[PDB]
Curated annotation (Swiss-Prot), chain A:
Record flagged with keyword Plastid: no
Post-translational note: Phosphorylated at Ser-56 by DAPK1 in response to oxidative stress and this phosphorylation enhances stress fiber formation in endothelial cells.
Result for mutant: residue 56 to A: Loss of phosphorylation and decreased formation of actin stress fibers
Protein name as catalogued: Tropomyosin alpha-1 chain
Residues the record lists as Phosphoserine modifications: 25, 44, 56
Region of the whole protein represented: 228 to 284 of 284
Organism: Homo sapiens (Human)
Residues found modified as Phosphotyrosine: 34
Signal peptide span: none
Length: 57, 52
């Protein structure tokens, strides 16, 4: 049982490391996508402004 | 996107209309100037006639 408990603790620590790494990975991906989506929204709003400028003629 | 695509034809038409309007205005200006010159020549001729 001592051997089994040590093995279990090692694998549990491995899984904890895994969840931590995945949490950083998802936080980074989310930030990158937030920046890109803001870029897209800005592009769309500027395009709407352009469209009204051409209609103004 | 579709808005700008179809309205671009409208922009092209506006440019062409402005060009054609300028051309027609210049042509009518030339015609008016010619007729004015001929009328002036006739007026001076008739003024000489009246003086005589």
């Amino acid at each position: 049982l001592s051997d089994k408990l040590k093995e279990a603790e090692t694998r549990a620590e491995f899984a904890e490391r895994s969840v931590t790494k995945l949490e950083k990975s998802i936080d980074d991906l989310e930030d990158e996508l937030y920046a890109q989506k803001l870029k897209y929204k800005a592009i769309s709003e500027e395009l709407d402004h352009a469209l009204n400028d051409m209609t103004s003629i | 996107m579709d808005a700008i695509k179809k309205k671009m034809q409208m922009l092209k038409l506006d440019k062409e209309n402005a060009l054609d309007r300028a051309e027609q205005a210049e042509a009518d200006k030339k015609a008016a100037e010619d007729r004015s010159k001929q009328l002036e020549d006739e007026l001076v001729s008739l003024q000489k006639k009246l003086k005589g």
